[PDB]
Amino acid sequence: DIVAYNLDALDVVKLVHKIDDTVPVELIQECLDCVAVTATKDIYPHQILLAQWVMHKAFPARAFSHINKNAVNHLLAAAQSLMWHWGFQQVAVFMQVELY
């Protein structure tokens, strides 16, 4: 099940459209491009919590505690895209972030 959830979370477009069909693909592409740089840093509990909240209609929440880091980064990108489309831009900003 964990391997399957990894291979699932490796895609974002399908999960995002499962949450909301009306999401532009440009936002998804921008979030993936930002993941390509952000994957180096660490993932912090607020990011995981927000991604679990936003993406449960397509991805189980508890799987976030079992899946690998790349899957978590892709799910963070998808959750940020969903927040950005919905209108909660402030929380969307706090998705792909580094500690300082």
Binding site: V3, A4, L7
Partner: protein
Amino acid sequence: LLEKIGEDWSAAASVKTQPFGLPSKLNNADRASTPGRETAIRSFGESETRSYNCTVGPGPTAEILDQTNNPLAHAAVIESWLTAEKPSSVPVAVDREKIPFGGSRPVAMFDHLLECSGIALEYAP
């Protein structure tokens, strides 16, 4: 009519694992939680592994037991099933270059335990 009517069939694509990676038995609460039993059948006993080692080269039998014993090999098998256009007729299940032999948990435990005694079984040169 008799008992042993069936309903004890135990098909399991993948079985939950102990902290020391090996399939385990099903406890009552965790055995009454799946449609039909999800037991890991010991279809490779000593006699079965004898027949396999003799009829087929020991290579494929060791590969099967490595897929079962090493959790990483089983994860690779499931990944190959899921990430293929044809889940049936997968060309190679586990890429042995990416996952070398010798990672099986019982064999690693045996080798480490011997090394703690100061000995290790190795091939003759």
